[PDB]
Structures are given as structure tokens and as C-alpha cells.
Amino acid sequence: GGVTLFVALYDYEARTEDDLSFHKGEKFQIVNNTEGDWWLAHSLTTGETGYIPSNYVAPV
């Protein structure tokens, strides 16, 4: 029931236009996970949406 938030396990510096940079501990709602291993995510810190590498996060 409800949503599953994700938390960053490691800092990450984006290297492409639509990717988010984030810190360890930053939390996300996942907007789309049906395109492959990069997920469209919405940061609970910044309010921004962009891609994150899914291996950098774990379910909260």
C-alpha cells in the first residue's frame, strides 16, 4: 500500500542534460521506471524531475 520512496546511497554528479545530481540521503519519488535502468525521479529536496541511475538508490 502507498508509495515507495527511494533514498540515494551515494552522491552523484550528472553528466548528461536530463540527469539529476544528488547527494547521499536525498529522497525521491519515482515517476517512471519502465524505460530501463535510468529512472525518471522527482526529488523531495529540490522538487526537480530528471533521470537517476537506479543502482544509486534503495527503497526507503
Architecture blueprint of SSEs:
Elements: E1 6-8, E2 27-32, E3 38-43, E4 49-53, E5 57-59
Antiparallel strand pairs: 1-2, 1-5, 2-3, 3-4
Briefly summarize what is shown.
This protein is 0% helix and 38% strand.
Model description:
By secondary structure, the chain is mainly beta. It has one domain. It contains no helices and five strands. Strands 4-3-2-1-5 form a five-stranded antiparallel beta sheet, with no helix packed on it. The chain is globular, with a radius of gyration of 10 Å. It starts with 5 loop residues before the first strand and ends with a strand.
Strand content: 35-45%
Number of domains: 1
Helix content: under 10%
Oligomer: monomer
Numbering strands along the chain, what is their spatial order in the largest sheet? 4-3-2-1-5
Tally of DSSP helical segments: 0
Largest sheet: 5 strands, antiparallel
Q: What series of H and E elements makes up the topology?
A: EEEEE
- What gyration radius follows from the Cα positions, in whole Å? 10 Å
Structural class: mainly beta
Which of globular, elongated, flat, extended, rod-shaped describes the shape? globular
Total beta strand runs: 5
Tell me the distance between the termini.
Answer: 14 Å
Domain SH3: 2-60
Protein name: Tyrosine-protein kinase Fyn
Family: Belongs to the protein kinase superfamily. Tyr protein kinase family. SRC subfamily.
Subcellular location: Cytoplasm; Nucleus; Cell membrane; Perikaryon
